[PDB]
Amino acid sequence: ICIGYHANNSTDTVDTVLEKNVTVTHSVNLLEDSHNGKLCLLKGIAPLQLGNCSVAGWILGNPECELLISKESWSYIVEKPNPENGTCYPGHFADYEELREQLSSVSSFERFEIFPKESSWPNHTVTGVSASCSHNGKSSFYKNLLWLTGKNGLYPNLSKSYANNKEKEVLVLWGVHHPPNIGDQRALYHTENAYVSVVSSHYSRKFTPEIAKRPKVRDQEGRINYYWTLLEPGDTIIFEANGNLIAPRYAFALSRGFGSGIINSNAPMDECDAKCQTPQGAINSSLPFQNVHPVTIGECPKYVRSAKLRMVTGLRNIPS
Amino acid sequence: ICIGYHANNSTDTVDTVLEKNVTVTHSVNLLEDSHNGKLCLLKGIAPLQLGNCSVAGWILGNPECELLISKESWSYIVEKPNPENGTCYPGHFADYEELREQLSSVSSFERFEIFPKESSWPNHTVTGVSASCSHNGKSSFYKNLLWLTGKNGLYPNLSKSYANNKEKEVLVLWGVHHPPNIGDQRALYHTENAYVSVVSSHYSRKFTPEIAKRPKVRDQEGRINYYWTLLEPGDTIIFEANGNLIAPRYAFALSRGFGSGIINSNAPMDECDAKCQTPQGAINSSLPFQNVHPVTIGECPKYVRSAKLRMVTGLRNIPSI
Amino acid sequence: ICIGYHANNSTDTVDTVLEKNVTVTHSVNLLEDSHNGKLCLLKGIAPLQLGNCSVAGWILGNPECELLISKESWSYIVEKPNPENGTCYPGHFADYEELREQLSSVSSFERFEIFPKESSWPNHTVTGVSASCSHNGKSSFYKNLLWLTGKNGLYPNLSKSYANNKEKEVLVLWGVHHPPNIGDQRALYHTENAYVSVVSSHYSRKFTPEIAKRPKVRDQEGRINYYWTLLEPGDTIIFEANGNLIAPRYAFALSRGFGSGIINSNAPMDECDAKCQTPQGAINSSLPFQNVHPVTIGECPKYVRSAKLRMVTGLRNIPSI
Amino acid sequence: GLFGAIAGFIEGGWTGMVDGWYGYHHQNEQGSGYAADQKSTQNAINGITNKVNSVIEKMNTQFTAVGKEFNKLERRMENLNKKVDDGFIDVWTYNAELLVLLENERTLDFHDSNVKNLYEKVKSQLKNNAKEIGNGCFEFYHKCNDECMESVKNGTYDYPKYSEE
Amino acid sequence: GLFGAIAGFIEGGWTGMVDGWYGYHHQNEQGSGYAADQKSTQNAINGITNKVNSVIEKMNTQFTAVGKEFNKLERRMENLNKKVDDGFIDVWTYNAELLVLLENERTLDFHDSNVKNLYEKVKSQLKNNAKEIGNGCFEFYHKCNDECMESVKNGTYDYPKYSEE
Amino acid sequence: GLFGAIAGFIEGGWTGMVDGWYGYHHQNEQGSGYAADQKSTQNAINGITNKVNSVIEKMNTQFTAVGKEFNKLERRMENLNKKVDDGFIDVWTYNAELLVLLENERTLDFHDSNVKNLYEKVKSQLKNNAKEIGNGCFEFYHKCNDECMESVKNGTYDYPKYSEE
Ligand SMILES: *[C@@H]1O[C@H](CO)[C@@H](O[C@@H]2O[C@H](CO)[C@@H](O[C@@H]3O[C@H](CO[C@H]4O[C@H](CO)[C@@H](O)[C@H](O)[C@@H]4O)[C@@H](O)[C@H](O[C@H]4O[C@H](CO)[C@@H](O)[C@H](O)[C@@H]4O[C@@H]4O[C@H](CO)[C@@H](O)[C@H](O)[C@H]4NC(C)=O)[C@@H]3O)[C@H](O)[C@H]2NC(C)=O)[C@H](O)[C@H]1NC(C)=O
Ligand SMILES: *[C@@H]1O[C@H](CO)[C@@H](O[C@@H]2O[C@H](CO)[C@@H](O[C@@H]3O[C@H](CO[C@H]4O[C@H](CO)[C@@H](O)[C@H](O)[C@@H]4O)[C@@H](O)[C@H](O[C@H]4O[C@H](CO)[C@@H](O)[C@H](O)[C@@H]4O[C@@H]4O[C@H](CO)[C@@H](O)[C@H](O)[C@H]4NC(C)=O)[C@@H]3O)[C@H](O)[C@H]2NC(C)=O)[C@H](O)[C@H]1NC(C)=O
Ligand SMILES: *[C@@H]1O[C@H](CO)[C@@H](O[C@@H]2O[C@H](CO)[C@@H](O[C@@H]3O[C@H](CO[C@H]4O[C@H](CO)[C@@H](O)[C@H](O)[C@@H]4O)[C@@H](O)[C@H](O[C@H]4O[C@H](CO)[C@@H](O)[C@H](O)[C@@H]4O[C@@H]4O[C@H](CO)[C@@H](O)[C@H](O)[C@H]4NC(C)=O)[C@@H]3O)[C@H](O)[C@H]2NC(C)=O)[C@H](O)[C@H]1NC(C)=O
Ligand SMILES: *[C@@H]1O[C@H](CO)[C@@H](O[C@@H]2O[C@H](CO)[C@@H](O[C@@H]3O[C@H](CO)[C@@H](O)[C@H](O[C@H]4O[C@H](CO)[C@@H](O)[C@H](O)[C@@H]4O[C@@H]4O[C@H](CO)[C@@H](O)[C@H](O)[C@H]4NC(C)=O)[C@@H]3O)[C@H](O)[C@H]2NC(C)=O)[C@H](O)[C@H]1NC(C)=O
Ligand SMILES: *[C@@H]1O[C@H](CO)[C@@H](O[C@@H]2O[C@H](CO)[C@@H](O[C@@H]3O[C@H](CO)[C@@H](O)[C@H](O[C@H]4O[C@H](CO)[C@@H](O)[C@H](O)[C@@H]4O)[C@@H]3O)[C@H](O)[C@H]2NC(C)=O)[C@H](O)[C@H]1NC(C)=O
Ligand SMILES: *[C@@H]1O[C@H](CO)[C@@H](O[C@@H]2O[C@H](CO)[C@@H](O[C@@H]3O[C@H](CO)[C@@H](O)[C@H](O[C@H]4O[C@H](CO)[C@@H](O)[C@H](O)[C@@H]4O)[C@@H]3O)[C@H](O)[C@H]2NC(C)=O)[C@H](O)[C@H]1NC(C)=O
Ligand SMILES: *[C@@H]1O[C@H](CO)[C@@H](O)[C@H](O)[C@H]1NC(C)=O
Ligand SMILES: *[C@@H]1O[C@H](CO)[C@@H](O)[C@H](O)[C@H]1NC(C)=O
Ligand SMILES: *[C@@H]1O[C@H](CO)[C@@H](O)[C@H](O)[C@H]1NC(C)=O
Ligand SMILES: *[C@@H]1O[C@H](CO)[C@@H](O)[C@H](O)[C@H]1NC(C)=O
Ligand SMILES: *[C@@H]1O[C@H](CO)[C@@H](O)[C@H](O)[C@H]1NC(C)=O
Ligand SMILES: *[C@@H]1O[C@H](CO)[C@@H](O)[C@H](O)[C@H]1NC(C)=O
Ligand SMILES: *[C@@H]1O[C@H](CO)[C@@H](O)[C@H](O)[C@H]1NC(C)=O
Ligand SMILES: *[C@@H]1O[C@H](CO)[C@@H](O)[C@H](O)[C@H]1NC(C)=O
Ligand SMILES: *[C@@H]1O[C@H](CO)[C@@H](O)[C@H](O)[C@H]1NC(C)=O
Ligand SMILES: *[C@@H]1O[C@H](CO)[C@@H](O)[C@H](O)[C@H]1NC(C)=O
Ligand SMILES: [Zn+2]
Ligand SMILES: [Zn+2]
């Protein structure tokens, strides 16, 4: 009778302390390296795939973002690294990176017209576009904002209020226009002082137009600075202006949720129902570690820089 | 002669690497799980109990915070998650969250009347209160700020200066008021242009009033924006305004220290002494780990989400022959 | 025949899990504790030694920082903990700390006269200095900005544009002057309105002078606020103004690079070629850890608070034949 | 390695042996073969399954961790985010890599103990009944058939020693 | 477990023995009883006391750690704060749980070593002086009285072996 | 300590022995001396060198990390920054110190095993050819010269026992 141990044909290398390249009979992967390569769903729900639009263009309605206006639910957001459709008319997006974080929290929308184009602004012209915001061969403008202009040689004092009876927080966006000439300012709003007041119960900001010559971006010398605020259930927001107001047309009743986020990726869309998604692809998660991408969405394994993570289960293999 | 080992009836469960539920002769709970349940003292000194007041009210002196004005030294601060007093006059508290962090460093106060109400402003009416800031049924205002108004149909040019001889940093507070009508602006301050200048050697800001209609908050259509700055030893602060200045009355000479903090807690106060305080209760720290709360104050065991942290000391237990 | 083990005279104490003070035959220090004591070079290239100047003064051209204007390349930057040469003419430095973080990435400069003193401003006097910015006994001014004044009782509408053809981001600086009196404002710019427009395709700001009496710092009651913006390749920056514009004179075409940084250190400069530099001194990095300083430059050992970290290699020492 | 059995006085494993990690190779007149042990084998499998499972358990699944997008004036905060993101990945990498490295040695030393502990419990069984060659083998002076040989699992022996001294 | 003593060739512990972790149960004609060892016992307590204290030493007390309360426009900075605070709690929770888990197997095997180290040093003393039964006991050829029995702590024996063959 | 060799049945080391970690001290009539082992020493050197190299490998070089200078209305971001810097220093200090502390006992016990593994393979070779005294030494009944002495590392023995019984 002889007492011994098992051995097989296994070529499973393992790095232990005091000895490398140690072949062993049994082990376990312990690290996920392969990925699906495609943009999957997330436990059924589909991601907000933005295409050529940036979040700025998606939420403001860059007219070239026509198709994104429909979708009001999603599991996560995917954005191109350099989307050419966004603030089609030049201007600054106040707290833009934050609105990304606000929306990165959002799980569902209720897009609704706070101030309907027809009948919200009588006595003010609303038929105003820019070649900067051109769509389908014609000059256009954002679908969610609205350019108020003087009507019949007059831009009468403006004052509009909205009441949040949506029992959800309502994201209102608006803009202020700065003409390049004093000529453009006088012909457009028929006044040179021009105030623009926006008041919620916890938000106040008075904008005044700074007229000056600026370098042409999207062949436009003027600018429209884009602002926005959250309006809690019950709150009312008061709009007052003498001219230069880029009024809100469509707003959003935001629904908050659990882990969502914006990712950058060139991976294609598929019908796979993955539980974890990364910019590189989905992951069929069973292991504790992974090394495909630090960006991750859902229930996923911890990302690590490692290549191996061997972890023997059996014993040394010694044939011959 | 026989070689063997000790054993008892101990039921001390322990998870080892190759076996869970391993019974052992001796072990030790390496993790603290029980807590005092009350807001205790911290090495004898008591914490600043804000009651129904928020930091906004305590530092501005919400008349309804009558009782917090005495305490001027403390080990830590307790705040209700949703404190019902605070501002009381609607507006923005410029940099609120930083000022909370500023006081989180403070170990003691010396509240003093930088601009005494009586004799600071002759030729300016200083008798101003609001129903929005009511105390004991009557209309009132903050204890530390002051609302200057026109006197005899006149709001003369204002310039008041303070030079810091307290050789401690002085937290200077003030505010600017925004009427809803042009009438209130004109009827109250006797001018519609209205400037408000506040200039130190490290702080300069010019304030101008924005008149407009706003949603009613605390039955008020106007607003008062609350500002503030620390003024280092030797420095001077100059307040100038043509109207709309809520002048400072009391400011604070800060003494900085280590270890205080702002915690939110509904646990009650007692006379127990304790080395560690959490929003949940005090902790009698002798272990290196704990799991009652991630927020902690004083000298405490490091917080972990763990439930056991057992750590056997003895060996396996095998009774009954 | 007997079987035993090695021993030597080694006094290497080490700590095991169940025993302290274990003397052993062989070990390794595993932790770097000694350092060079001097600010050395880094793989040959030398640091931008700022001397008595602060970043604000170096990049603005504080006349007292005459000698720093030449250096346009470096491995790292050193600042005295209390540099007495900076913004000689008082004012706010808009986003100073950010401009510092901006310069931490820059590996090379290209300082060039964006708006040449002679020929950039005819019809405006540019020979304006202040005793606050005195250099070598005479009042001077910043070497990179330029003080535009009235000429022949007129401050004509100003407009100067620059186009970035350097294929690198151009760090443009400028400033706005706020007089203390209304007298100085009218006497200096011949107007009380005074606008200042600075416009890129990604930056727009209109500056206005807030005139008020302020505490004299560097015996000056006025102030100059320092603004700046990086200008992207292809972009153009337009400056328009009615007065109070401290125009840019010299700009910087920044070249970004790898791991550089700003450190505070009072150690002297030497000629050593260290692979790692810390505020305390250089480190001849071979060990995996270090404890001289948490701040580090180059490729260095991980900083830890530890004192020993021995790690035996040999075995227990049992001498005496 | 740590114990003298594997790669020590038992210089190899047996490709012939399947159905387990440890066992025996009896050389009897009623046929020979590699009878795989049962008690210590399943015990080692139990222990190794808990090691693995008790180790992946200590790793909570990474939930949504995405980039943060700072603006032109927030480089400091932009770097701080990177310092946190990287500083932690560095910590989890080390924790992950150092765990397999050290605990792999323990596992081999763990198996070594089991085989060496199996070499015992038979020397404690075959007290005087067989000549021990230091190769992990026992030549019986006995003529132990496949009935008493299968009695190495328990042991109720036709005990009398045969004169072989 | 790792060594064969506990739950191995000594399948149980002695409730009778107190005054130590290891010891003996001598069966002499002058009375029996559980004489608990001292040297290996106090030596073991020293080490376990060192391990425990050397482990809690490596854990500095916390201190005041307070929330940070951000505003409605500082959402990014809030998550980064939540990312740092949570990220560190995890690194400490994991480490703490993984430490007792790994170090428990080490302590249990340490007592195993200590016991197996005591089963020896008596076989090394009773070379030909007693019959070794694999239950951790030694039946003496000698009639070792309660004078030489306590001389198992050291051993200065009237050594000549008596035949029992 | 963990194994019975060091401070156990071989209570000491030999200053005389150099050129290796383990070996022998033969006391022969043809001269004595400290012939240091070769195979077990260099094998232990390979392992501890890999241990060390495998430990510092797992520690990335700290590239530029510098202070960040926050503003007067940025106490919060200033404190959060310090919370990160300190938190990571705390984690690396504990990871570093706890590793040498734990790995020190493992390294010492590793040598213990190597020596106890050398005490065997010689007790296992000199089955009946030498007297085993409990001080880690073997008294030859043989007068083993400098030919069979280097034949204890290996061996094709003039095996027949000559009587001393
Ligand atoms: C939604 O998103 C889509 C993208 O999917 C976007 O459509 C693109 O819009 C841009 C304009 O913003 C278009 O780029 C233009 O291309 C024109 C033709 O291409 C020329 O150059 C290429 C390469 O050399 C040649 O192959 C070709 O034969 C042409 O020479 C071009 O005419 C445009 O260039 C100038 O023209 C206009 C007015 O005439 C004016 O904006 C500028 O003068 C402009 O830029 C000039 O060049 C540089 C730029 O590198 C600039 O720095 C410089 O200041 C300008 N010069 C002067 C004197 O000022 C421009 O390059 C593009 O073709 C469109 N389509 C596609 C498929 O890309 C929509 O506009 C978006 N809709 C929204 C947001 O509503
Ligand atoms: C934080 O915020 C709250 C306010 O939101 C405040 O709590 C209340 O504080 C007030 C005092 O301002 C309490 O209100 C009443 O005061 C009367 C005075 O009591 C006598 O006490 C002595 C000796 O006799 C003297 O000093 C004094 O002059 C008086 O002689 C008292 O008569 C009131 O009692 C009850 O009567 C009515 C019935 O309708 C009711 O309106 C009161 O609210 C209270 O009703 C309820 O009954 C029972 C028994 O009291 C009680 O179990 C129940 O909780 C009460 N109500 C509620 C909603 O819980 C009363 O004392 C009042 O008790 C305090 N609590 C509440 C909930 O209002 C805190 O003091 C603030 N903390 C600070 C500022 O530190
Ligand atoms: C940061 O800021 C300070 C001030 O800007 C500066 O250092 C201090 O001040 C001066 C620099 O302005 C330092 O050096 C001086 O050198 C001059 C004379 O030496 C010769 O210098 C050059 C080159 O050789 C030539 O012009 C010519 O050869 C000069 O003769 C002179 O300015 C100083 O001389 C003495 O007299 C002045 C009055 O003019 C008096 O104020 C000084 O205190 C000084 O007395 C000397 O004190 C020092 C202290 O020990 C020492 O040298 C000795 O005891 C005294 N002199 C003698 C002969 O024994 C002076 O030599 C000066 O040393 C700096 N002081 C300290 C304490 O360091 C830094 O250099 C700046 N760093 C920068 C800008 O990077
Ligand atoms: C480049 O860097 C150099 C440093 O190498 C700078 O120079 C140093 O800094 C000061 C400005 O030049 C000089 O400081 C001096 O200190 C002396 C102390 O007695 C004295 O000469 C002055 O200080 C006070 O002295 C008097 C009191 O009796 C006052 O009349 C006098 O005006 C000063 O008074 C008050 O000082 C306090 C400070 O606590 C202030 O709070 C008050 O505001 C001051 N009074 C008033 C009315 O405002 C004098 O300041 C120092 O000599 C000088 N030189 C050196 C070598 O350090 C350069 O300025 C700098 N240049 C740049 C940046 O362009
Ligand atoms: C993102 O941006 C790019 C450009 O800004 C854009 O890619 C364009 O997509 C559309 C559709 O995929 C393409 O428009 C087509 O152009 C060619 C002909 O040159 C054809 O694919 C189409 O013509 C035929 O197809 C259909 C019949 O089977 C009919 O639809 C049609 O009448 C024709 O018969 C159509 O003209 C365009 O060419 C590309 N450009 C590229 C790929 O460079 C993309 O759509 C944008 N994504 C958005 C806005 O979501
Ligand atoms: C210190 O804190 C106390 C609370 O602890 C605070 O007093 C409370 O204030 C609110 C508002 O004054 C009260 O809540 C009210 O409930 C009553 C009846 O139950 C209503 O009349 C109020 O309704 C509104 O009425 C109109 C319709 O909406 C509006 O035009 C108007 O603006 C009112 O908001 C409101 O629902 C509450 O009763 C009191 N009292 C208590 C005990 O809570 C006090 O004001 C704080 N200190 C200071 C100085 O403000
Ligand atoms: C080991 O053996 C089986 C067949 O006996 C085979 O399927 C497997 O691929 C082999 N692996 C090798 C040779 O690496
Ligand atoms: C490492 O890899 C295999 C075994 O893992 C084997 O060839 C040898 O040990 C090493 N490689 C070479 C080329 O020797
Ligand atoms: C717009 O026009 C008429 C005046 O022509 C006015 O009576 C009416 O009320 C106005 N509607 C508004 C301001 O909504
Ligand atoms: C305003 O103050 C002046 C300051 O000298 C003083 O004469 C008087 O109290 C006031 N002026 C009046 C009452 O005309
Ligand atoms: C009072 O100050 C205002 C602005 O500060 C100014 O217009 C007015 O001339 C001043 N009155 C004086 C100096 O009498
Ligand atoms: C500052 O000066 C005033 C004099 O008006 C004095 O009352 C006060 O005590 C001084 N401060 C200190 C700390 O002494
Ligand atoms: C709890 O508090 C102290 C302070 O840590 C501690 O030493 C003591 O044993 C406990 N009991 C009492 C009554 O303080
Ligand atoms: C550590 O050991 C050294 C050398 O054996 C000795 O000098 C010193 O006293 C010891 N230190 C202790 C036990 O703290
Ligand atoms: C001032 O400069 C402008 C152009 O920069 C020129 O038109 C004008 O004639 C100049 N005036 C002089 C030189 O007096
Ligand atoms: C660094 O300095 C010299 C040159 O590299 C070298 O001889 C010395 O040993 C080094 N010091 C260390 C590694 O502490
Ligand atoms: Zn369309
Ligand atoms: Zn000079």
CB atoms within 5 A of ion ligand 18 belong to: C 66, 136
| N residues, chain F | 165
Token pair of B68, please? 């917090």
Instruction: Please identify which residue in the block is written with the tokens 């991601």.
Output: A47
Question: What type of residue is F165?
Answer: E
Beta strand A251-256 with A111-112: parallel, antiparallel or unpaired? antiparallel
Instruction: Show the DSSP H helices in chain B as ranges.
Output: 55-60, 96-103, 117-120, 182-189
Amino acid making up residue A16: T
If residue D53 lies in a helix (H) or strand (E), which one and from where to where?
helix D39-56
F123 Cβ under 8 Å from any chain B Cβ: no
Q: Which residues contact C185 (CB under 8 A, 6 or more apart)?
A: C179, C191, C192, C194, C209, C211, C243, C244
**Which three-class secondary structure state does DSSP give residue A60?**
helix
CA pair distance A189, A158, nearest whole angstrom: 11
Residue F104 is inside which H or E element, if any?
helix F75-119
Residue position matching structure tokens 């700074």: A210
Q: Roughly how many angstroms between the first and final C-alpha of chain B, as a whole number?
A: 18
Count other C-beta atoms under 10 Å from residue C57's C-beta: 24
**Same domain? C258 vs C112:** yes
Residues in chain C: 321
For residues C51 and C265, is the Cβ–Cβ distance under 8 A? no
| Amino acid residing at B203 | Y
Q: How far apart are CA B16 and CA A230, in angstroms?
A: 52
Q: Does one domain contain both C134 and C12?
A: no
- CA A39 vs. chain centroid, Å, equals 17
User: CB neighbours (10 Å) of residue F139?
Assistant: 12
Q: Is any Cβ of chain C less than 8 angstroms from the Cβ of E113? A: no
CB of E33 within 8 Å of a chain C CB? The answer is no
C319 and C246 within one domain: no
- Taking CA–CA distances from E29, the nearest residue in chain B reads B1
Strands C31-32 and C289-290 turn out to be: parallel
CB–CB of D50/B17 below 8 Å? yes
Angle between helices F75-119 and D75-119 (to 10 degrees): 20
Cα B23 to ligand 14 centroid, rounded to whole Å: 38
**B165 close to ligand 12 (CB < 6 Angstrom):** yes
Nearest atom, ligand 2, residue B52 CA = 1
Residue E142 burial class via C-beta count within 10 angstroms: exposed 0-12, middle 13-18, buried 19 and up: middle
Give backbone dihedrals phi and psi of B241, rounded to 5 degrees, phi first: -165, 150
The number of angstroms, rounded, from the C-alpha of D90 to the middle of its chain's C-alpha atoms is 31
User: How far is the C-alpha of F75 from the C-alpha of A113, rounded, in Å?
Assistant: 42
**Inter-axis angle of helices E75-119 and D75-119, nearest 10:** 20
CB A147 within 8 A of CB A128: yes
A217 - beta bridge partners? A220
Count other Cβ atoms within 10 Å, centred on residue A127.
Answer: 10
E strands, chain E, are 22-24, 26-28, 31-33, 130-133, 137-140
Q: How many CB atoms lie within 10 A of CB B255?
A: 15
Residue B78 CA to residue D79 CA, distance in Å, equals: 33
CA atoms within 13 A on the CB side of C185: 24
**Number of domains comprising chain F:** 1
- Specify whether the CB–CB gap between C319 and F85 falls below 8 A: no
Breaks in chain D after residues (C–N exceeding 2.5 Å): none
CA A123 to ligand 9 center in whole angstroms = 6
Q: Which of E140, E101, E149, E110 is nearest to E5 (CA)?
A: E110
- d(Cα A106, Cα A259) in Å, to the nearest integer? 9
Query: Which experiment gave this structure?
Result: X-ray
d(CA C252, CA D144): 95
Residue numbers of the domain that contains C301: 1-39+271-321
Same domain for B68 and B207?
Answer: yes
Nearest CA-CA partner of D6 in A31, D14, E27: D14
Cα separations (Å) of C231 from C108, C199, C254, C260?
Answer: 16, 10, 10, 22
- The minimal CB distance from D80 to the residues F54, F60, F84 is found for F84
Q: Which residue, A275, B16, D143, is CA-closest to E110?
A: B16
Strands A204-207 and A196-199: antiparallel
CA angle F20, F21, F25 (to 5 degrees): 80
CB B141 within 8 A of CB B128: yes
Is the separation of the CB atoms in A31 and A15 below 8 Å?
no
In this structure, the answer to whether residues A122 and A230 fall within a common structural domain is: yes
Buried b (16+ CB within 10 A) or exposed e, B221-232: bbbbbbbbbbbe
Cα atoms in the Cβ-side hemisphere of radius 13 Å centred on C8: 14
The ligand 7 atom at the shortest distance from the C-alpha of residue A8 is 1
CB C176 within 8 A of CB C196: yes
**Which residue of A8, A9, A23 sits with most ligand 7 atoms within 8 Å of its CB, as the best mutation to test the pocket?**
A9
User: What whole-number distance in Å separates Cα of residue A217 and Cα of residue C312?
Assistant: 67
CA quadruple B240, B244, B249, B254: dihedral positive or negative? negative
- The pocket around ligand 5, CB under 6 angstroms, is made up of A 51-52, 64
Interface size B-F, in CB pairs within 8 Å, comes to 13
What phi, psi does B34 have (nearest 5°)? -90, 150
Number of domains observed in the structure of chain A:
2
CB atoms within 10 A of CB B44: 7
Query: Are A252 and A301 part of one and the same domain?
Result: no
Using an 8 Å Cβ cutoff, are B289 and B32 in contact? yes
Q: Does F50 touch chain A (CB under 8 A)?
A: yes
Tokens of D116: 């060496």
Residue E130 carries which DSSP code? Answer: E
Ligand 3 binding pocket (C-beta < 6 A) is C 51-52
Q: Are D30 and D156 in contact (CB under 8 A)?
A: no
Q: Which of C278, C103, C37 is nearest to F68 (CA)?
A: C103
Block residue for tokens 């792999």: D104
Instruction: Dig out the tokens for D158 from the structure.
Output: 């036709």
Structure tokens at F80: 């959060």
Task: Examine the domain organization and report whether B23 and B54 are in the same domain.
Answer: no
In this structure, the answer to whether residues C32 and C100 fall within a common structural domain is no
**β strands within E14-143, DSSP E:** 22-24, 26-28, 31-33, 130-133, 137-140
CA pair distance C65, C88, nearest whole angstrom: 11
Give the alpha-carbon dihedral of E87, E89, E91, E95, to 10 degrees. -170
Angle CA(B21)–CA(B23)–CA(B27) in degrees, nearest 5? Answer: 105
Q: Are residues A151 and A101 in the same domain?
A: yes
Rounded CA gap, A27 and D39, in Å?
22
- Closest CA–CA distance from residue D118 to any residue of chain E (Å): 9
β-strands A196-199, A236-241 pairing: antiparallel
Which is the closest atom of ligand 8 to the Cα of A21?
Answer: 5
At which of B254, B270, B286 does a domain end?
Answer: B270
Owner of token pair 């943060």: D68
Element (H, E) at D138: strand D137-140
- Of F15, F39, F35, F38, the closest CA to residue F27 belongs to F35
Closest of B191, B196, B190 to residue B177, by C-alpha? B196
Both A253 and A193 in a single domain? yes
Residue A123's CB is within 10 A of a number of other CB atoms, namely 13
With beta carbons less than 8 A apart as the criterion, state whether A194 and A244 touch: yes
Q: B184-187 contacts: CB < 8 A, separation 24 or more?
A: B184/B222, B185/B209, B185/B211, B185/B243, B185/B244
Q: What percent of chain E is helix, strand and coil (3-state, nearest 5)?
A: 40, 15, 45
Q: Which residues of A131-161 are buried (b: 16+ CB within 10 A; e: fewer)?
A: ebbbbeeeebbbbbbbbbbbbeeebeebebe
Give the CB-side neighbour count of residue A200, counting CA atoms within 13 A.
18
Cβ–ligand 15 contact at C123 (below 6 Å): yes
Question: Which residue's CA is minimally distant from atom 55 of ligand 4?
Answer: C84
Identify whether residues B292 and B252 lie together within a single domain. no
- What does DSSP assign to residue F23? E
Q: Return the beta strands (E) in A138-235 as ranges.
A: 138-140, 145-147, 149-150, 158-163, 169-178, 196-199, 204-207, 223-231
- CA dist., res. C283 & res. C111, Å (int): 33
Max CA distance (Å), chain D = 96
Between β-strands A145-147 and B138-140, what pairing exists: parallel, antiparallel or unpaired?
unpaired
Are B179 and B190 in contact by the 8 Å Cβ rule? The answer is: no
Residue D160 is part of which domain span? 1-165
Chain mean position to CA D19: 15
Q: Which of A256, A254, A251, A95 is nearest to A173 (CA)?
A: A251
Q: Which two tokens stand for residue F41?
A: 């020493």
**Are E95 and F90 a contacting pair at CB < 8 A?**
no
A226 in Cβ contact with A175 (< 8 Å)? yes
E107 token code pair = 């302590």
Per-residue tokens: A119:
């009948």
Amino acid at C177: H
Compute the distance from residue B132 Cα to the ligand 6 centre, in Å: 9
Whether residues C97 and F63 touch (CB distance < 8 A) is answered with no
The pair of three-digit structure tokens given for residue C165, joined into one six-digit string:
């053809």
Rounded Cα gap, residues A20 and F57, in angstroms: 13
CA distances from B45 to B40, B109, B252, B275, B281 (A): 9, 15, 21, 11, 16
DSSP B222-243: SEEEEEEEEE-TT-EEEEEESS
Contacts of A123 (CB under 8 A, 6+ apart): A151, A154, A156
Instruction: Give the CA distances from residue E149 to residues B53, B188, E24, E115, E145, in Å, rounded to whole numbers and listed in that order.
Output: 78, 107, 10, 19, 6
Same domain, C150 and C251: yes
Supply angle C-alpha C218, C220, C222, rounded to 5. 135
Q: Could you please report the per-residue DSSP string of C193-228?
A: S--EEEE-SS-EEEE---------BTTB--EEEEEE
The four Cα atoms C24, C25, C31, C33 give a dihedral, to 10 degrees, of: 100
In ligand 6, the atom with minimum distance to the C-alpha of B132 is 50
In the numeric block, which tokens belong to residue F77?
A: 């971001």
* Cα–Cα distance measured from residue D65 to residue E4, given in angstroms and rounded to the nearest whole number: 48
CA distance linking residue E38 with residue F4, whole number of Å: 18
Sheet holding B262-264, edge to edge: B48-49, B77-79, B262-264
Strands C236-241, C196-199: pairing is antiparallel
| Residue B272 CB–ligand 13 contact under 6 Å | no
Place of tokens 């038992």: D10
From C284, C285, C289, mutation site for ligand 16 pocket: most ligand atoms within 8 A of C-beta? C284
Q: Which two tokens stand for residue C119?
A: 């020929």
Token pair of A97, please?
A: 């990176």
**Residue whose token pair is 């979708």:** A71
Q: Which of A7, A259, A315 sits opposite D108 (nearest CB)?
A: A315
Of C227, C251, C270, which residue constitutes the final position of a domain? C270
Residue B119: which region, alpha, beta or left (left: phi > 0; alpha: psi -120 to 50)? left
Q: Which residue has the tokens 């001498």?
A: C319
